[PDB]
Structure formats: C-alpha cells, structure tokens
Amino acid sequence: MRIESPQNPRVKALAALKERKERERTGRFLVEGRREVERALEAGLSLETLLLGPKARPEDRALAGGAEVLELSERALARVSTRENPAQVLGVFRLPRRSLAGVTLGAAPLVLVLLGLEKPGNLGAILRAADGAGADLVLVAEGVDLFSPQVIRNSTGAVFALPVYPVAEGEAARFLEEHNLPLVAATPEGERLYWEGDYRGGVAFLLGAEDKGLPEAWKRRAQVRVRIPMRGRADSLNVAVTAALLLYEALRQRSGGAPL
C-alpha cells in the first residue's frame, strides 16, 4: 500500500525506531539508504519491511525478497527518516542478538579493542577502517549501540558485515587471554614506534576512545606500548585515523613487510 499522512499510526511506529529503547522493545531497527540496505541484506540480516519513497527506483523493489513493500509520501518519508534529505530506500530489519559465545578467530588474527564509549562519528569511521583492513574482530565497550541510525550512516553500513561485539572489559580480557596473541597498547607515550611491533602472528591492538583515552590498567598489562610518531605541532591524531594506521601496519606485515 501507500501511506500519505505523517500522522498515520504505521508512520509513527516507524519513526519511533529512532530511539534505542524502542528498537529493544520491538526487536526491530531501521536501515536508511539503498547502499546500507544492500549491505544489511548481504550480511544476512532479516528484512521485514521495505520502505520506498516517492523518488525510489524500480530496481529498489527487487530488494524486498518477499517482504512487505510499503510506499511512503514525501511527508511520511521525512517523518521516518533521520536524515536532512531522506534516502528513498529504507528497510525494517530484525535486531539480532550479538554475542562472543563460541566465536572463533582465524589464523594470525587482526583484532582491535576499542576501550570505552565512543561517539557515533568516530565509531563509524573506526568501523570503516577496520572494514578496509579486514580486521578479524572488533571489540567495543559494553554499552555501545551498533544499530543506531548514526553508526549505520557513518559506517556506510560497514557495521553489518564486520565481526564487531559490545563486551564488558572483563569478558574481553578473558576472551583475548584464551588466544596466543600479543596485547599491543596504542598511546602517544608508547616506548616503541608502532612499526617496531611484530604483528606477523596476529595482534590485538588496545585503543582508547577519543575522550577517555587508554585506561592505565590496560596500558600496564600490554606486552608492548606503541606510539605513532608525531612530527609537527599536534600532540595526537584522531582516534579513527589512529585505528586505520595501526590496522594497515599489521596488514603490511601480514603482506610480507618486515617490522622496523
């Protein structure tokens, strides 16, 4: 069917999914954007309803795969959207439960441990970097929301295929301990250059969120603390840039590059 009024109860229900509490209550979440919807589908998430705006393309209908297709008016679409200018393709997906239970890591795994709550902008950028480098696992803080409109948007949907899990620090520590993997703490005060670390057999990088920084306890127990060199006026890099540099250095060594 097609819904005209932004006051229609279905539209109100869809708009309510902007809130985390409503996503948890309903077990549903909204994915906005043609690209983001394709990414969620590819990742194996279950589509319940496809939403199409007035400027949707005929190809967008093929994304439904049997799900309900709901057409929205311009005004109805604007109510449901979290964007300045709404995407013309959106999907209502089942909110999956994520858990490290039984998760196994491949050989010489590249792991990023992001300590502390992170802002959605940074978080999206970090996930994109992890996606690019082919990280085997990303651990984030226990309360991190990976299904918010902002994280989905800022990661361009990279969040969906990535092995990323919100976990308490205690659980994370115990999980990492089970593997023969070095803990490498990133910090501008690190004693070694990050190029000097040996990541050829895998690595779990420890990286603090932007405003929290690396917790002293994690810095202490790391096998090595590494810095990215700063050669100008700035005392530190953005957290996502830091994450990319670390992951791509591990990738360089996996690709045959020698530690410095």
Distance CA 260, CA 258 (A): 6
Contacting residue, 93, 147, 160, 165, with its own copies by CB under 8 A: 160
Give burial (CB, 10 Å; 0-12/13-18/19+) of 143. Answer: exposed
Shortest distance, CB of residue 95 to K ion, whole angstroms? 9
Choosing among ligand ADN, its own copies, K ion, none, which partner's interface includes residue 133 (Cβ < 5 to 8 Å by kind)?
its own copies
**Helix or strand or coil: residue 127?**
helix
Asked if residue 256 belongs to a known ligand binding site, the reply is no
Q: Counting every residue, how long is the chain? A: 260
Question: How many residues bind its own copies, per CB under 8 A?
Answer: 41
Q: Which is nearer to K ion, 22 or 198 (CB)?
A: 22
- The Cβ of residue 68 has, within 10 Å, a number of other Cβ atoms equal to 12
Residue 105 binds its own copies, judged by CB under 8 A = no
Distance CA 172, CA 104 (A): 14
* DSSP label of 131: H
Contacting residue, 158, 184, 206, 226, with its own copies by CB under 8 A: 158
Shortest distance, CB of residue 37 to its own copies, whole angstroms? 13
Residues forming contacts to ligand ADN in the complex (CB under 6 A) are: 186-188, 190, 207-208, 210, 213-214, 227-228, 230, 236-237, 239, 242
Asked if residue 1 belongs to a known ligand binding site, the reply is no
Whole-number Cα distances in Å, 180 to 68, 102, 160: 47, 17, 27
Looking only at residues 24 through 43 of this chain, which bind K ion when binding is defined by CB under 5 A?
27
Residue 132 binds its own copies, judged by CB under 8 A = yes
Choosing among its own copies, K ion, ligand ADN, none, which partner's interface includes residue 106 (Cβ < 5 to 8 Å by kind)?
none
How big is the chain by its Cα radius of gyration, in Å?
21
Residue 256 binds its own copies, judged by CB under 8 A = yes
Contacting residue, 56, 70, 89, 133, with its own copies by CB under 8 A: 133
For residue 172, how many C-alpha atoms fall within 13 Å in the half-sphere facing its CB? 23
Distance CA 164, CA 113 (A): 10
Long-range pairs, 58-63, Cβ under 8 A, ≥24: 60/34, 60/88, 60/89, 63/34, 63/37, 63/38, 63/89, 63/91
Please give the residue ranges that form the binding site for K ion (CB under 5 A).
Answer: 27
Please give the residue ranges that form the binding site for its own copies (CB under 8 A).
Answer: 39, 42, 125, 128-135, 155-158, 160-162, 193, 195, 228-234, 237-238, 240-241, 244-245, 248, 251-252, 255-258, 260
Binding site as annotated, residues for adenosine:
208, 228, 230, 237
